[PDB]
């Protein structure tokens, strides 16, 4: 393998798993074996919980500003090591260096930095009842929480989950995707180097159906935060609920609508649509994979999309000039190609792409060309179902209410956006769209201040923003009686 | 039966169920049938959801103050009908008229009154990103939500759940316990009279295993709020999660500790201990059913409890002078009796009652005498398990830290209280107790302003307070891009 | 004297002034003497304060909800007597019944109703410092506060000032404009009748120079809320500050800009411009009295404004069909006529109006015709100074930056607005305008939820919204030390 | 002079004043002239204002996180230079190195650090009105603000004022007391070094006799933040209000009561009393200079107080072992000795101290002995008036209500404290004390999170805590009309 065997991270150091088993992590660009990685056993989970329990106490006993300084130091190290972490994330994900260097660690660290500053701002309430009684609330740490990560933005997700959890005084046990375990382990090292107490951020590697479930089932874990696909999230949430009634946050999939109204500048609209479909090779949960264009503008829009797609630079993710890499894995590629075949079979018109790229060195990896289908219909499989690949579906509409009705006609509801220059239309339409993440005249930006998450089957709870911090604490109400107590007995 | 057959409440009127089936609600004071009540069918649930979908739109389309006024009118009607409703509640629950007339509706309306005034205060956030871009959030209604009630405080719980739900612009379908269906239907009538649009508060009667489950499963319901036992809670939360990923609130059971410190006045202590154990005949989720007393004070304390318990006026709930009624149902009495026997079997010392009361008329009702066990041990079944009856377990401790640790040694975490006159000890101890509802030198008061709910397996989320109003809305983030859009492609 | 002599309102009833002096309130519609009004002496002020001090204790002694119900009761009475109060305001101000019936009491009561619902929501904070210490804050009433009203919206202003003050648990002493004393006295009666404790809302009539100054000087008054001209506002603030360091809030004058952008609908633009200049006969502080029109639209815009101005129904305020009445007083009419002459003298082109209306019975009243000046320059007196009458100044511009700089080029900064259909321009321009009250594609609406007040010379602090309620309490921080205390000595 | 001539700080460097005038700053330990210091001219104030106007634009055009990082960098430098700055502050104030090294810069930077983390948290509101219209608020910088510091904690106060001002995106022109100008100039160098843009923190030297008044009266300054005596505050606020209606925050003087209740540990109570009177040689606004002791304990309390006072280590501030330094200046010494005379003259019993210490070297300094008067009475000049020196007044009382009533009988209201072990009495008592800063069983701690400031003539507005940050922004409300506009004309 390229790297030495990856071990569990428990108690501020690497420790040996006790399962006797390992798995491999593969570079999607060339099929290379990056590392053997240990599978945590059930007993290893137990060890991580007890470690977390004890570390959480040390961490909560500090002052708010002491925690803040430690998380800020972690931010400082992340900025220093951005490029090195990016290179590793590229190996592990297949995503272009041009993305990992500018987005993944940058925005992951942005959120850690945001919450680090907010630690001292976590406050309870005080309410007077009468002269002889008042109540005050405490926002106490939950204690030990678990994060379960997805493979498309490994370290960024580890950061978005751990930042609020640690800032609120918790310990987090994090399980990266079996598909992408490498950067999560580096994060844990960096937390320790920053002065995060032993046990406060532990990492367990392995599968979702095993280690994931052992975490969601454990009676001492008070909250689960999960990122991934909707069907998986239902299982995770059921398990977290029936085991011990955990609090849960779910960031799931979607089939987000992008509505281009007739007064839109078509260049901006095309720029938005491509960015909404082909960043990270189309492997972004919030992608605008149903693009609605007015009948009167279909041809010109298509021409603009085509021009942009034809100049997309698919290639070796190691090459800085690349802006479009392979998919995360061969099995994911096969899934995407199946959707592409479905699109052809159901008679959607292929505007461009539609196949795997195998020329030269690309045969070694899992490269699917940026793909655009048009003349789509709402009942098509590619229009209804999340593909999580570089596959745009263009849909013609005739009026605004129709476009909106159709955009809303889905069990998903993660994101939505509109392109228009009209003041009234922009807000009116966005207010009617049933999604948690709404963009006007742009797409994809997810500022640390902005709470993000899904409506409907696209999520439970939110991430980022002030409010999320609050959801990593639990409220204790304390009523102080200063007067007499009356009994009816 | 005493009353006519109770029908479903859908769309601002009573409609016939389509199950062809009924159940009986039984006066626990005398075993008589109060009414036959229709069971909702699966198609009845579907009917109620479509009704709520349409009503919610009418409700949400009004202004904040319009909703506020309508809810305040409901409050006025409730105050008007306090005694009448208290009478119906007494029949249905067996609870003394002296409780229902002054607690149930009073505090139910209190919470509704609280939220009615807060409708105009529900706000989003605005966050500038840069000169050319900013974000605002909207707190939109979830849409259709469902409440599932417990039998100990039927109309109160229906009010605590429906108030924040409707104030936040939602429609609620509410399912009363099969045990106590009567007052919920009355509430529905009152809401309609008050001007609540048709379909905004619908009531479905029947069993949890059927209608309850049909509600937690339905794809169009966005949130479930449940009150009941932890065991049932787990199944309800699992179902709500895995079906369509609904948001959930769970107000569950407990085994709440009351720690009496040496410096406490033992009169207040005894008053608190008894109030925390025998009000509503011991059928309060937050009851302090593990009472910790210092060894040096056990004797004097037991004497004060006994004296108090011996003057408790058990009797007919219709008699204004009764302050201790029968239990809610015969099967429930049997369950409590079993627990009492377990106490006897496990060699806890009986100090009080410990048997059914059959003297004369009481033989026709489900009466259990106020019961105190002392000399208990943490391993006894009556100490580890929720009884939900008039059964106090007195436990002896030798030091503060020991007491606090043993109080925390439970999977429950609903309530906790201390009795002490020392400034430092009151706050110090309370901060260390793992429960969401904490009382100092008092017990039982639950002001509308105070967020209440459980730690650990005692619940998920909270009710009442400013915070709960927020959790009946979904956050939508809107990024407005006023400037150029950059694409990497 | 159509009405009897008006006395002071102290301690829940009318009482005799000890000044031996009175003044007359007129009726600008004809010349009538509506009534004689007592002048408060310095001793009456002292008396109103002691009354306020004792009433405030009673008011504050109540529960949040108790205060809430009482203020809600007052709202109910105000809705009942809307038309009656309106008729009285119409006599006392000259404002058309059409306005006073639909605006003055309606929106005055809106604000009171908004705040009544919010009483229970006033809360402090809780901040943990460390295991052995935490702090909580209380928001306590200031105590006794004073409101000084303006004459353009007498009862609405009394309501906007008293509502938040009373809701936060204070007593207010209110001083109406000498010009318009009548409706304030009625409001006092209405409060008392609703259950407001004696002394909590007292009314003192007389001059600003005297009783106004006596209020701002009193060492027992904790806060002053003032509405009027900027010149007077300066005097008032200096007095309130230098005497006893009172908290202060001031809503003052303006010369608010309205920018019509070249993409605007001219019908809407003209509607907005006329509404922004001629409602209440041009006696609104927030009026858009500098109207910027793009050169390309000037001719079409002037035509559209003229057509609307010419159909303005000036007339008897008593007639339901009147929508434009006399000014508030003859002296004020003279001031307006002076400004109008200034405009003529400096060679502004007169588009319409420009003189007193004396035909028929109108000659008995203080009627100035709807006046529009065009071809204005920024250094004209009518463009530079607040006229507070029916006089619109139209200013041509060539580009956005120019219009914005000019709009900002003033010591005022109360309000501003833009008319445009472009999403980007609407928000971009509004963000650059230096005013506290900004309207996009509308003008004049002032929701109870919306904080309003001026930038620069146009005011200090705000009215309405959640923020204003907070500013009628004072913050007390309480640090609870539960551990050891350390001295360096 | 020990140092070279001190210049003005404008635009990120030192510049020559244009007054032709200088003043001296004197080491109060030895009468040594530390430095000549230039006096800003009126044209210099103008120059600083124009510099701030331009710097503020650069500062406010950065992102929130950019501002945050720059303030965090200033924090790091302050931590680095803590001892160096402490040494210089000791020279300037005469305060013991043991104080300046552990309090002044530490707690100054604590507040800056606190606010640095909060920059991204400053948000507006969003309020929906109806489907076709909503409002959002912006929290915009005030622009240019002025801070006016006191001489007792020169650099700490400079930090406490500039931190929230800069965090909220303003520029601040700061005027240190002529008595202590040195460290503020260093602070300005440090901000510049951290990356604060030129003009954002400017420092002008001079006195309240000239530059103080030029700052407060300046038309382009939007807010004044002032710390000093109530008498001076009154003048300042009159000027700020009447010149251009500035917002004003004032932290003024006090005569803060410390109530020792009969159940208190007299050792703690004594520790508290001495800490509350002799830290910084009694030069602390919040000092508990009226100490209420119950008659039954007077004797014992005076003994413990005397015992502690006698072991106070008065001496050279340059010596680490010193914990009690000279006063800040010889004129201030004269003022204090005057009050001590008044004490003697009004026949209060002198328990200890009461004179200038002139032994050996101390003769060359401004040392006043730790002084305690007892058997005091409420009409005594030393009891009503702020001395701002080492002069404790002990007062006997008989019952609880009396102590409280007397503690509240003052025009002051800055701080208050109670010592007691009783839960009920602690909260009860503190809730009735009319002060903004209340301590239970401790004294003097002022956490960055705790809003602090005075009731009554002791201050206007607050410093520190979340709420203070909001007060360095101004609210703009924006109503967006998406629907039709309705005109009555
Ligand atoms: O005290 P419990 O915890 O047994 O029940 C309290 C409430 O939840 C309902 N409930 C019980 N089981 C389920 C279930 N499996 N799914 C949904 N709701 C349920 C009850 O139905 P029920 O009407 O049978 O009490 C009742 O209204
Ligand atoms: K991999
Ligand atoms: K959901
Ligand atoms: K029943
Ligand atoms: K839980
Ligand atoms: K009049
Ligand atoms: K101002
Ligand atoms: K000095
Ligand atoms: K004050």
mmCIF file of C-alpha atoms in Angstrom, chain A residues 390-478:
data_model
loop_
_atom_site.group_PDB
_atom_site.id
_atom_site.type_symbol
_atom_site.label_atom_id
_atom_site.label_comp_id
_atom_site.label_asym_id
_atom_site.label_seq_id
_atom_site.Cartn_x
_atom_site.Cartn_y
_atom_site.Cartn_z
ATOM 1 C CA UNK A 390 -22.322 14.358 -13.212
ATOM 2 C CA UNK A 391 -25.778 14.121 -14.788
ATOM 3 C CA UNK A 392 -27.885 17.219 -15.412
ATOM 4 C CA UNK A 393 -31.579 16.862 -16.382
ATOM 5 C CA UNK A 394 -33.053 19.795 -18.302
ATOM 6 C CA UNK A 395 -36.844 20.199 -18.126
ATOM 7 C CA UNK A 396 -38.982 22.573 -20.181
ATOM 8 C CA UNK A 397 -41.806 24.510 -18.510
ATOM 9 C CA UNK A 398 -44.331 27.084 -19.727
ATOM 10 C CA UNK A 399 -45.361 29.071 -16.640
ATOM 11 C CA UNK A 400 -44.025 30.061 -13.209
ATOM 12 C CA UNK A 401 -46.635 28.277 -11.072
ATOM 13 C CA UNK A 402 -46.104 25.163 -13.128
ATOM 14 C CA UNK A 403 -42.316 25.332 -12.671
ATOM 15 C CA UNK A 404 -42.762 25.802 -8.914
ATOM 16 C CA UNK A 405 -45.338 23.005 -8.568
ATOM 17 C CA UNK A 406 -42.990 20.642 -10.385
ATOM 18 C CA UNK A 407 -39.909 21.766 -8.459
ATOM 19 C CA UNK A 408 -41.810 20.945 -5.270
ATOM 20 C CA UNK A 409 -43.132 17.603 -6.561
ATOM 21 C CA UNK A 410 -40.623 15.308 -4.847
ATOM 22 C CA UNK A 411 -40.047 13.665 -1.472
ATOM 23 C CA UNK A 412 -36.714 15.463 -1.270
ATOM 24 C CA UNK A 413 -36.254 19.089 -0.240
ATOM 25 C CA UNK A 414 -32.609 19.825 0.478
ATOM 26 C CA UNK A 415 -31.907 22.779 -1.786
ATOM 27 C CA UNK A 416 -33.515 24.940 -4.445
ATOM 28 C CA UNK A 417 -32.640 28.001 -6.467
ATOM 29 C CA UNK A 418 -33.973 30.503 -8.956
ATOM 30 C CA UNK A 419 -32.361 32.690 -11.568
ATOM 31 C CA UNK A 420 -34.128 35.947 -12.274
ATOM 32 C CA UNK A 421 -33.512 39.692 -12.331
ATOM 33 C CA UNK A 422 -36.980 40.544 -11.062
ATOM 34 C CA UNK A 423 -37.168 41.592 -7.407
ATOM 35 C CA UNK A 424 -40.712 40.336 -6.756
ATOM 36 C CA UNK A 425 -40.292 37.044 -8.632
ATOM 37 C CA UNK A 426 -37.032 36.203 -6.873
ATOM 38 C CA UNK A 427 -38.428 36.353 -3.338
ATOM 39 C CA UNK A 428 -41.958 35.182 -4.223
ATOM 40 C CA UNK A 429 -40.670 32.038 -5.932
ATOM 41 C CA UNK A 430 -38.046 31.208 -3.282
ATOM 42 C CA UNK A 431 -40.646 31.572 -0.504
ATOM 43 C CA UNK A 432 -42.772 28.940 -2.260
ATOM 44 C CA UNK A 433 -40.005 26.390 -2.821
ATOM 45 C CA UNK A 434 -39.939 23.581 -0.278
ATOM 46 C CA UNK A 435 -36.232 23.309 0.536
ATOM 47 C CA UNK A 436 -33.986 24.260 3.437
ATOM 48 C CA UNK A 437 -31.174 25.719 1.344
ATOM 49 C CA UNK A 438 -32.278 28.366 -1.135
ATOM 50 C CA UNK A 439 -30.145 30.304 -3.612
ATOM 51 C CA UNK A 440 -31.084 33.367 -5.640
ATOM 52 C CA UNK A 441 -28.876 34.048 -8.666
ATOM 53 C CA UNK A 442 -26.089 31.779 -7.400
ATOM 54 C CA UNK A 443 -25.494 28.202 -6.227
ATOM 55 C CA UNK A 444 -23.308 26.204 -3.873
ATOM 56 C CA UNK A 445 -22.007 28.684 -1.305
ATOM 57 C CA UNK A 446 -22.591 27.487 2.255
ATOM 58 C CA UNK A 447 -21.324 30.189 4.657
ATOM 59 C CA UNK A 448 -20.523 29.211 8.231
ATOM 60 C CA UNK A 449 -23.250 31.576 9.471
ATOM 61 C CA UNK A 450 -25.975 29.978 7.296
ATOM 62 C CA UNK A 451 -27.950 27.065 8.812
ATOM 63 C CA UNK A 452 -28.241 24.344 6.188
ATOM 64 C CA UNK A 453 -30.300 21.162 6.028
ATOM 65 C CA UNK A 454 -33.235 19.469 4.369
ATOM 66 C CA UNK A 455 -36.996 19.791 4.283
ATOM 67 C CA UNK A 456 -38.983 16.550 3.923
ATOM 68 C CA UNK A 457 -36.965 13.412 3.377
ATOM 69 C CA UNK A 458 -33.738 15.403 2.872
ATOM 70 C CA UNK A 459 -32.729 15.785 6.513
ATOM 71 C CA UNK A 460 -33.531 16.287 10.169
ATOM 72 C CA UNK A 461 -32.201 19.344 11.964
ATOM 73 C CA UNK A 462 -29.509 21.661 10.586
ATOM 74 C CA UNK A 463 -25.770 22.310 10.433
ATOM 75 C CA UNK A 464 -23.856 25.589 10.688
ATOM 76 C CA UNK A 465 -25.174 28.923 11.932
ATOM 77 C CA UNK A 466 -25.901 30.035 15.492
ATOM 78 C CA UNK A 467 -28.820 27.673 15.956
ATOM 79 C CA UNK A 468 -26.833 24.517 15.336
ATOM 80 C CA UNK A 469 -24.546 25.271 18.271
ATOM 81 C CA UNK A 470 -27.623 25.310 20.462
ATOM 82 C CA UNK A 471 -28.535 21.772 19.331
ATOM 83 C CA UNK A 472 -25.324 20.348 20.793
ATOM 84 C CA UNK A 473 -26.434 21.368 24.278
ATOM 85 C CA UNK A 474 -29.370 20.167 26.360
ATOM 86 C CA UNK A 475 -31.564 22.518 28.341
ATOM 87 C CA UNK A 476 -31.827 22.180 32.095
ATOM 88 C CA UNK A 477 -34.507 24.311 33.702
ATOM 89 C CA UNK A 478 -33.865 25.240 37.339
#
